[PDB]
Amino acid sequence: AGPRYPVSVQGAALVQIKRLQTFAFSVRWSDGSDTFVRRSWDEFRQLKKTLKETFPVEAGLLRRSDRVLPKLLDAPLLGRVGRTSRGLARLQLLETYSRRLLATAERVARSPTITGFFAPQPLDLEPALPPGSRVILPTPEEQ
């Protein structure tokens, strides 16, 4: 069966959206593919929730190989919250965390949920985002 799963994800970019900025990733998949995509922290929040719906593991009650989702590692809390700051924290955290997902569990790592998560986002499929948007770009690796 042809894999449709990223082997790795790297934090690709920042796009400025409302008091949540949206954060880009680049993931390249076992089929050899490479992708760079934009994501929201709010989008992640759905994404974590969404895996967690597929993974009852989160609390470790069900299994003993069960911390493989050690919930999420997070930097010092809030610091006057700062919604940007939480995206900012989340960017660093999320990349450790996503890297955990591609190592800390196989069972998470391919689940159909994985395929949705790394699948296209319309906002990634929009060449420009609203005028107030600032997009932070990595220097391209490919042509």
UniProtKB/Swiss-Prot annotation:
Tissue specificity comment: Expressed in testis, small and large intestines, liver, kidney and pancreas. Isoform 3 is mainly expressed in colon. Isoform 1 is preferentially expressed in testis.
GO CC aspect terms: cytoplasm; NADPH oxidase complex; plasma membrane
Keywords: Cell membrane, Lipid-binding, Membrane, Repeat, SH3 domain
Superkingdom classification of source: Eukaryota
GO molecular function, one term: phospholipid binding
PX domain residues: 1-125
GO biological-process terms attached to the record: extracellular matrix disassembly; regulation of hydrogen peroxide metabolic process; regulation of respiratory burst; superoxide anion generation
UniProt function note: Constitutively potentiates the superoxide-generating activity of NOX1 and NOX3 and is required for the biogenesis of otoconia/otolith, which are crystalline structures of the inner ear involved in the perception of gravity. Isoform 3 is more potent than isoform 1 in activating NOX3. Together with NOXA1, may also substitute to NCF1/p47phox and NCF2/p67phox in supporting the phagocyte NOX2/gp91phox superoxide-generating activity.
Quaternary organization: Interacts with NOX1, NOXA1, CYBA/p22phox and NCF2/p67phox. Interacts with SH3PXD2A and SH3PXD2B.
Domain description: The PX domain mediates lipid-binding, localization to the plasma membrane and is required for NOX1 activation. The SH3 domains mediate interaction with CYBA/p22phox. Also mediates intramolecular interaction with the proline-rich region.
Protein name: NADPH oxidase organizer 1
Residues of the full protein shown: 2 to 149 of 376
